[PDB]
């Protein structure tokens with residue numbers, strides 16, 4: 029609702045963007061993601077290449093960060109780093125809460141500078 | 142133009158937000174900022190309290206980061222930390238470039254977790 033309007037705005041900004049972005053609901057479900065995000069996490073696991081070449085460790089780390097973000101309350105945000113397929117990334121997460129205490133979290137990812 | 146539309150979207154997302162955000166043009170001019178950002182940097186210098194209690198060192202650091210962001214090209218982004226009035230902050234910067242090679246940079250700031 030007001031969540032849908034928020035999503036439409038994120039989409040307007042990020043739909044054609046090189047910056048991988050997504051928005052997830054309280055059930056860890058993606059409710060918005062752009063092409064860049066889809067492509068980033070579409071890399072097939074290469075389990076033998078190294079410990080960062082599968083999604084599972086990073087998934088738990090990122091889900092854990094997201095839970096922390098949800099817990100910090102409306103407007104809470106932070107930036108952290110993680111490794112994925114041999115590259116270092118940063119991720120910013122932000123808590124957006126709505127009048128019905130519905131919580132969504134914005135993810136924005138970049139390659140580490 | 143297309144910059145104005147981008148700005149309208151950022152405004153829709155961040156106008157009522159606790160998250161300090163701004164957008165600056167190539168001449169280091171603010172073309173959008175929300176209330177949270179205005180309030181953050183409205184703190185009067187307290188030059189005697191410590192080296193982080195004035196805007197000048199952080200201004201040069203942040204302007205330097207911004208120039209790097211501009212140089213990295215469309216879609217470039219990174220997260221860094223800085224100190225201001227005795228607190229640690231993170232800042233994410235993102236390069237948004239338009240078809241006429243007009244460059245704007247989004248700033249998003251948070252208190253360090």
Ligand SMILES: [Cl-]
Nearest residue numbers: 107108109110
């Ligand atoms: Cl980190």
Ligand SMILES: [Cl-]
Nearest residue numbers: 220221222223
């Ligand atoms: Cl830093």
Ligand code: NA
Nearest residue numbers: 098099100101
């Ligand atoms: Na909370």
Ligand code: NA
Nearest residue numbers: 211212213214
């Ligand atoms: Na460049």
